[PDB]
Each structure stands twice: as C-alpha cells, then as structure tokens.
Design a protein around this ligand. Sequence first.
Ligand SMILES: Nc1nc2c(ncn2[C@@H]2O[C@H](COP(=O)(O)OP(=O)(O)NP(=O)(O)O)[C@@H](O)[C@H]2O)c(=O)[nH]1
Ligand SMILES: Fc1ccc(Nc2c3c(nc4ccc(Cl)cc24)CCCC3)cc1Cl
Ligand SMILES: [Mg+2]
Lengths: 471, 167, 166
Amino acid sequence: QMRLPSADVYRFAEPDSEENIIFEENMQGIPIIKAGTVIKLIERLTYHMYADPNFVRTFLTTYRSFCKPQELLSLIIERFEIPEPEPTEADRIAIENGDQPLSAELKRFRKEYIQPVQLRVLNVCRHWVEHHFYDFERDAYLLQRMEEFIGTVRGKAMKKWVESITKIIQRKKIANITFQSSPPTVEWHISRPGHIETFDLLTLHPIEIARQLTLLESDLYRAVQPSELVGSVWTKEDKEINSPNLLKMIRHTTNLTLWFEKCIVETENLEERVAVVSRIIEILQVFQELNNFNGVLEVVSAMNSSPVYRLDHTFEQIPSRQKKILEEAHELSEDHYKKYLAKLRSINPPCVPFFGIYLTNILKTEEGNPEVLKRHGKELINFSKRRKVAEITGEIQQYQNQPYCLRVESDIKRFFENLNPMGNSMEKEFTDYLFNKSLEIEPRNPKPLPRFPKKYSYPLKSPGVRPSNPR
Amino acid sequence: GMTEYKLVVVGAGGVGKSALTIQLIQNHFVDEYDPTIEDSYRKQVVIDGETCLLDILDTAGQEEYSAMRDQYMRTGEGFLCVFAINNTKSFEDIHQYREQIKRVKDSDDVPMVLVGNKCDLAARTVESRQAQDLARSYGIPYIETSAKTRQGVEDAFYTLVREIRQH
Amino acid sequence: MTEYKLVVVGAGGVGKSALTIQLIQNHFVDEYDPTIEDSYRKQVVIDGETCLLDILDTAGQEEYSAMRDQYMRTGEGFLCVFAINNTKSFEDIHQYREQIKRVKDSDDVPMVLVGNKCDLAARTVESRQAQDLARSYGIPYIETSAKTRQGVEDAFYTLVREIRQH
Ligand SMILES: Nc1nc2c(ncn2[C@@H]2O[C@H](COP(=O)(O)OP(=O)(O)NP(=O)(O)O)[C@@H](O)[C@H]2O)c(=O)[nH]1
Ligand SMILES: Fc1ccc(Nc2c3c(nc4ccc(Cl)cc24)CCCC3)cc1Cl
Ligand SMILES: [Mg+2]
C-alpha cells in the first residue's frame, strides 16, 4: 500500500474515521457514503482508487446546500496540489554513488495517486463547466478563477485535458438531431394550412393537436434545469427568478386544462358538447400513444374538475369505449400514481413525464431529512439526503434526452403557445365563471335540463385518430 | 378489514406545509424520510380505541398546478386546511380552499380541520384568536402545530378523523 | 426493469463519446473533447423488455491508461471500439480485450467489436480483418457511424443481448 503525504501538509490524507465519514451498510463495488465532512466528500469525489461519475453529477447538482461555489473551487484546487514524496533510502544510496535512482515509490505514487486524483479533479471541473455552468453565469469572478486554474496547470500528463477544458469554457461563454426515419406527415382537418384564424379545438385535426402539444410540452419538459429544483426554490419567494422554465411548463399545463374546461362548458348545446368532450378524449388517446403523460393528465384534470365532472348528461352520451379510455387514464393517478409510475418505467421513450410527483418528492426529501448528522461531537454533512434528491433530478434528466420524431407546424405551435383561456380575468373569477356556466348548461337536480341553440356552423364529425398516409 | 380514511392536506406552498404529514408518518424518533416509497403516506393508528388506516394525500410542491386541485380534492373524505402562522397571505387563502372543497364535494358540511402551522422561528403574524374566530365562523376545529417539535401533529389528524366519524 | 452496466473502451479519438451521445441524444458531436470518465443512463425497450442502460464512457488517451481496472470491474459488458480509418486503433483492441479478461478473470465476458466511422470512404482496416478477430474472440462485429447513426443501436443493443444471455 502507498504511503501518503502528512495530513499536516495535505488535508485530504487524514485517515477515514466515524468522526469524518460514515458509509451506508450496503456496498455498490464501491462504498456508498451516508455522511461526511466536506473534506472527506471532496476526497471521495476525486478518489484515487475508483471512478464514480454518478457521484460527480450528484455532488455538483446538490453541493450548494453545504458549500459555496467559491469554496468548492478552493477545495478542489487544494486537492489537486499534491506533494510528491522525498527519495527513499535506496534512492538516497544510489544518488550518493552517482547513479540514477530507481525512484520506484515516487513513480508508483505519481502513477497511482497523483495522476488519478488530478485527472478526477479535472473531471469535476469539466462536469462543473459543461453541466452546471450557471454557477459561472451568476458569478464572473468564479469563472475567472476557474480559467486561471485550468490555464496554469503544467505538466505533459494533464495537458490534453487542460487544453480541452480551456476550449470548452470558451465555447460555453459564447453559447443537430438525427433520426432514424422521417416524421409522419402533418394532418389537417377543417382548418387548412395558413388559416390560423379558423384554428380551434374542433377545426384542427385531433391527431395534429396532440402532436403539436406533445412537441411543445416536450420542449418545456426538456428545458427544466436541476438548478430550478434543488433547494425547493420553485416554492419560494424568488421562484420566478430561480425556476422560470419549470413555471412556464406548469403554466402551459394549467392553461391547457382550463382551455379544455372552457371549450366544454361554453358549448351550451348538449349534442355539440358531447362532440367537444369526445374530441378531447380522442386527443387523450393520441397523447397516450405518444407517451405524453403530461398531456394525458391535462385532459384527466380537466375531466375531473368541478365544472366538467358534474356534467352527467354529457357523460351519458359519450361512447362506452371512450369512457373506458378516460377511466383508464384516470386510474393512472389513483393510489398515489401507482399505475402511472409503473407505466412510465415500462414504456419506450421519448415520453413527456408528469413533473408534479418529482416536485413533491424533491420537496419532501429536502424537508423530511436533516442537513447534518451529529456523530461523536462532530457535524457531518448528510449526503444520503443529497443523493436522494440527485436520484430524482437524474431520472428527470434521463427522460429529457430523447427527442420526438415529429414535425413542427409553426402556426399550430404558435396557436397553442398563445392560448389564453383566462383572458384578463383573475383565476378565481374565471374559475367561478366556469362553474356557473356548468350550472347553467346542466342545472342541479331537480331542475330539468334546458335546451340551447347550436354554435358551430361546421361539421362536428371527428376525422378520428388513426393517421393517414399518401404516397 | 379496518376502516380506511382518505385524508387530503391543502394550503399555500412554500411555508412548511409538508412537515405536518411527514412528522405524522415519520419514524418518530429518527429524522428521516423517503417520500418515494409506499408506506410513506399510509399509517395504521388507534383513535379512541378504534384501529383504522390513514391514507394521506399531500401534494406539497404542486401548488402551481392549480387546475389539478379539484381532482386531488375529489379523492378525500376529510381535509386539513393548512396555513402558516407567520404568513398572513396563506391564512387569507383559507376561505377559497374551503369554498373549493365544498364545491368539489358538493356539500356545505365537509369534514375538515383548520391547521395553523409554525414552520420556523420568524415572528407570528396570525394570532391564534384570529384563527379561532375564523374556525368558529366555519364550524370547524382549529389546531396549532409546530413543524419542528411534532407538537399538535397527532391532534390535527386525530381530530379530523373524529370529524369524519361524527359526520 | 433490469439494469445493464455497459462500458465503452478503445483508443483515443475513435468516437466512443460520439457513439454514446448519438445513442443517448440522437445528436452527433463534432468536437473532439477527450473524455476522462462520463456516465449516461437510458431507459429502452429491447426485444419487448424494458431495460435501464448505464453507459460508462471511458478515456482513450494513453495518459489515463492506469485507471482502467476500476471501470472494468463494474462493467457487465464492453463495447470495444476502433476506427476503420485508423489501423493503430485496431491494433490497440487486443490490449483492451486482454485487460478486460484479466481484470474480470474470465474468458466469457460479454463484448461487441465495433468499427466506427464507417461513413468515411478512406478505410484502412478491412472488414474481413476485423471479422476474423471478432470470431477469434467469439463476439460479433458491427460497423458504425456516430454521425449517421448507422449500426449504433445495433451495436449497443447487441451488447445488451449478450449480457442478457450471459
Ligand atoms: N466522420 C465521423 N467522425 C466521427 C465519428 N465518431 C466520432 N467522430 C469524430 O471523431 C472525433 C473523436 O470523437 P470522440 O467521440 O471524442 O472520440 P473518443 O473516442 O470519445 N475520444 P477520447 O478517448 O479521448 O474520449 C470527433 O471530432 C468526432 O466528431 C463517426 O462515426 N464519423
Ligand atoms: F363527459 C363527461 C362529463 C363528466 C364526467 N365525469 C365522470 C363521471 C364518472 N366517472 C368519471 C371517471 C373519470 C373521470 Cl375523468 C370523469 C368521470 C361517473 C359519474 C358520471 C360522471 C365524465 C365525462 Cl366523459
Ligand atoms: Mg470520449
């Protein structure tokens, strides 16, 4: 076994003890850290014995809750700067006789301790810059320090990565898809291409509605960074500052749900309303086919809302096969999303997950676990809590990789980007309006059902949700 | 074979709401939680000598999904309406939550409790007398809880179960 | 769902990272940024079964040659990559094969031989030559292009099949 530098000149050579590090009982074949000092966390982050790139992502995603970015940079620079040992007795004797020392211990220490640790420090810098660049975006001095450190690393052994990381940093400062097969043809119904003024729920093709919403919702899903999640910042005062992508995504979902509800209760005529609901369930069907689970729940939420859920006369006339489609989608959310979670884990991506349960799990993980563990008089960073958060952000990221093979239709995309069912009204008054509309079109028992004039001048018959294909 | 109560926690985000259900379900005696595993929101308890099963839905963190409120609420037979005692806005929100619950359940008499939660050591801005008055005007119990010490947590959930049993 | 630990090894610059990122993101990386050690996950349905792939992307540069043992211990299967326009990278393959066998102390390690950059006309390693070596190892040989996606899924999912039947 290799001798180490004295802990007096190199802090990362302190022996492991239960006062500075605690392991999970379960291996995997590398140890799992339950808790430790920052020093010990950083030593294991850059350990000479093994690599653990997943630890790097975990640490870089979550470290800010126990260490400042400026301090992290200081510590890994400190980790990088390893003293070499002095010649041994055998070396000494060779030198005293005018011979070249074998330097066996020095060479082994360079090869098996210094170079792996330095390389792994560089790997942290690389990951930090490529995947967590916001620390540098928000603090230019931190970036200057990083550039300086990287730019002044000497020695032929690190040279390739140092030159690379320098270039990577420069690129990141001033800052595409291949398939596999071509996307299916864009489908059109009553509204023809270019006629955005006629675009509406029943006039667009239900297939193309689902596709373009799935593209939109996928882009929104894919844009959310871990920095919008860690620290539960999307729930705090500065949420619009710290979580703008998450909140845009959630607001899209909310607006689509409200739009479905509005389309339904503003269709006073029963027969037409049945056509509207049936079209929405068809759009749900295409969402399921595309694994757009956010889109699925958008519809389900709308159908279970107070204004819509109570429309018994409408539900009555919905074909039994669509009732089953709706009920099956609803059952995904039952028992704390038990069937949703099983389905997400079994499908072939691309998909659009429902983000909501990730937020709840991250919030609760962070709220229900202490920041530190107290052991033998010492305060240790509770790292298993951070690993739990990083497992959730990691799963989020895993589903953000796969792009949809679907063609954008710019006008339909724009139509849904600009959807604004609430208009200038505040939520409560719009929401009270929807429910009053519901009461109007289907009054409570024992009030008899009124009739209402039709409002749609074009045909109500759906073109269906099976895709067509000309030569 | 025992009775199972479907309990739903509602209230403003960002002010320690999730601590209530976590402290209930929690180990007790060990500060730890994995919301990811089942049994993290289900709990067998004895209330006035009758054993029952608590299923608690707390979607803390999803407050911005405001159009999902109705569907989440629909699932419950009893409700905890939670505000933070250092956040007046969360207290003023209570009325709309109650109105929304009534609408979803289609009833003027839904088992619910009002819960004032102390989530940190910041200054209180909602006096307990204000919350008492509000609760009395609604005809529902009021319980104050601490998010750190577990005080009042059992009382909040047990009281709600009594409201259900006596409905 | 079963989890598979895949490891991609081979000389520097043969396109290990480009292959991996094409698989993960459907995107061709044009830049040549030497890897130290990167990790990717992919949920995918292969032969009707849902898998979770953990892909370890490794360093080809010789300066990192002393750090291979540690990733070879965890790997269940290995993509051994060379570039068909780089004879030396083909000659380096046998050193990876032997080290993997040594580290795992087994003659029976799931493996696929991959000849990358098959989109380039200027070939210097002939398919027959690579095929002969693959046969001597008892493993399949697949030619790929990280740029066009040719053979990319075939190479990775074949490795998965071999881990499955191992
Ligand atoms: N034409 C073509 N170029 C490719 C292909 N695969 C990789 N390249 C190019 O070759 C270079 C090296 O790719 P890279 O993936 O970084 O190789 P690597 O094996 O990961 N290198 P390292 O061992 O240092 O990490 C890049 O410029 C990349 O664009 C391919 O299939 N076709
Ligand atoms: F047009 C409608 C109007 C309203 C509804 N509401 C629903 C009703 C029932 N079960 C449901 C199950 C699940 C969803 Cl999501 C909604 C449901 C049974 C009672 C009757 C209303 C459904 C349709 Cl199709
Ligand atoms: Mg690489």
